[PDB]
């Protein structure tokens, strides 16, 4: 359960880039991408934890994730709402 950022495989990164319309990827992208993804996750997860904690729970629910995302200018549709 360490450096699981490496669990984000290179192809996984490239495929996202492709979906974004990226045709060629610099060899230094993989690491740079991770440094951004991680921050995104940190901000969203933490808010979800904050909401979870407020509610006195241990299990993070989809709703806690939705509130965390929501407030960042990102409503997510599909998990309730």
């Amino acid at each position: 359960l360490r450096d699981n950022i490496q669990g984000i495989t290179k192809p996984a990164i490239r495929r996202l880039a492709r979906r974004g319309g990226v045709k060629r990827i610099s060899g230094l992208i993989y690491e740079e991408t991770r440094g951004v993804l991680k921050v995104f996750l940190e901000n969203v997860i933490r808010d979800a934890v904050t909401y979870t904690e407020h509610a006195k729970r241990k299990t993070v629910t989809a709703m806690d994730v939705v509130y965390a995302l929501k407030r960042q200018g990102r409503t997510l549709y599909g998990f309730g709402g």
Binding site: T75, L76, Y77, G78, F79, G80, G81
Partner: protein, 94 residues
């Protein structure tokens, strides 16, 4: 059992008027439910502010109307206004 509310039944009906021969997946329905709750909150939220700003305790068809104009862009906003204005005019006439 506890019970949950949604607009699934109303969404089906609307679908029938636009596309009488089509259905909808459970996910698309879940999305439409997320959608309705989002729009509702925004309009009600903005309407809340208008009532507050203009020193009122009541939301009327106008606060709803103005909230619509502020939230919706271009013409889409207009049809919503036309239909609302009418629905009230009509409701009291129906």
């Amino acid at each position: 059992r506890s019970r949950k509310e949604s607009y699934s039944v109303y969404v089906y009906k609307v679908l029938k008027q636009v596309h009488p021969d089509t259905g909808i997946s459970s996910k698309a329905m879940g999305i439409m439910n997320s959608f309705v709750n989002d729009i509702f909150e925004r309009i009600a939220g903005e309407a809340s502010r208008l009532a507050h700003y203009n020193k009122r305790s009541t939301i009327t068809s106008r606060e709803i109307q103005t909230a619509v104009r502020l939230l919706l862009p271009g013409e889409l906003a207009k049809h919503a206004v036309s239909e609302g204005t009418k629905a009230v005019t009509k409701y009291t006439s129906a």
